[PDB]
Amino acid sequence: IKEDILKDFEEFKGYLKKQVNRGKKLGLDDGKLVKSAAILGDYLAKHEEPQNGEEMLLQELWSVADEDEKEHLAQLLVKLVDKQ
Amino acid sequence: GTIKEDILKDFEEFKGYLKKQVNRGKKLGLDDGKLVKSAAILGDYLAKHEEPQNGEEMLLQELWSVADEDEKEHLAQLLVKLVDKQ
Q: What gap in Å lies between CA B2 and CA A65, rounded to an integer?
A: 22
Measured between beta carbons, the chain A residues lying within 8 angstroms of B46 are none
> Do residue A83 and residue B66 have CB atoms under 8 angstroms apart?
yes
Residue B7 structural domain: 1-86
Q: Tell me the CATH number at B50.
A: 1.10.760.20
Distance from CA of A43 to the nearest CA of B (A): 17
Per the structure, how many domains does chain B have? Answer: 1
Phi, psi dihedrals of residue A14, rounded to the nearest 5°: -65, -40
| Disruptive mutation site among A55, A56, A75 for chain B (greatest number of B CBs within 10 Å) | A56
Q: Which technique was used to obtain these atomic coordinates?
A: X-ray
* Phi-psi label, residue B49: left if phi above 0, alpha if psi -120 to 50, beta otherwise: left
How far is Cα of residue A61 from the mean position of the Cα atoms in its chain? 12
Q: What gap in Å lies between CA A48 and CA A56, rounded to an integer?
A: 10
Q: Tell which residue, A64, A53, A39, has the closest CA to residue A4.
A: A53
How many residue pairs bridge chain A and chain B with CB atoms within 8 Å of each other? 88
> Do residue B78 and residue A69 have CB atoms under 8 angstroms apart?
yes
Measured between beta carbons, the chain B residues lying within 8 angstroms of A36 are none
Question: What's chain A's length in residues?
Answer: 84
Q: A73: nearest CA in chain B?
A: B75
Resolution limit in angstroms? 2.0
